[PDB]
Structure 1
Amino acid sequence: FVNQHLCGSHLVEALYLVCGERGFFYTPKT
């Protein structure tokens, strides 16, 4: 895999692809 530059919803899509059925938590600063 390659490193990623992901902002906004692109990060959420990446988390979704990476975590699959496990799901994930999205926790921005502030």
Structure 2
Amino acid sequence: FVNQHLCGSHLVEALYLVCGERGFFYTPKT
């Protein structure tokens, strides 16, 4: 596939896409 900048809501959209049913954590403080 590719590497892009994924930021903010676009990042969590991507996480959703990628992880789906597995679920994911979005933890910007790290």
TM-score w.r.t. the length of structure 2 is 0.83
Structure 1 counterpart of 2:23: 23
Identity %: 100
Q: Give the ranges of 4+ consecutive aligned residues of structure 1 lying more than 3 Å apart after TM superposition.
A: none
Number of residue pairs the alignment of both structures matches: 30
Cα shift at 1:21: 0.5
TM-score, with structure 1 as normaliser:
0.83
The structure richer in strand per residue is: 2
- Post-superposition Cα deviations, 1:1-30, rounded to whole Å, max 9, x if no partner, equal 100211110000000000010010000027
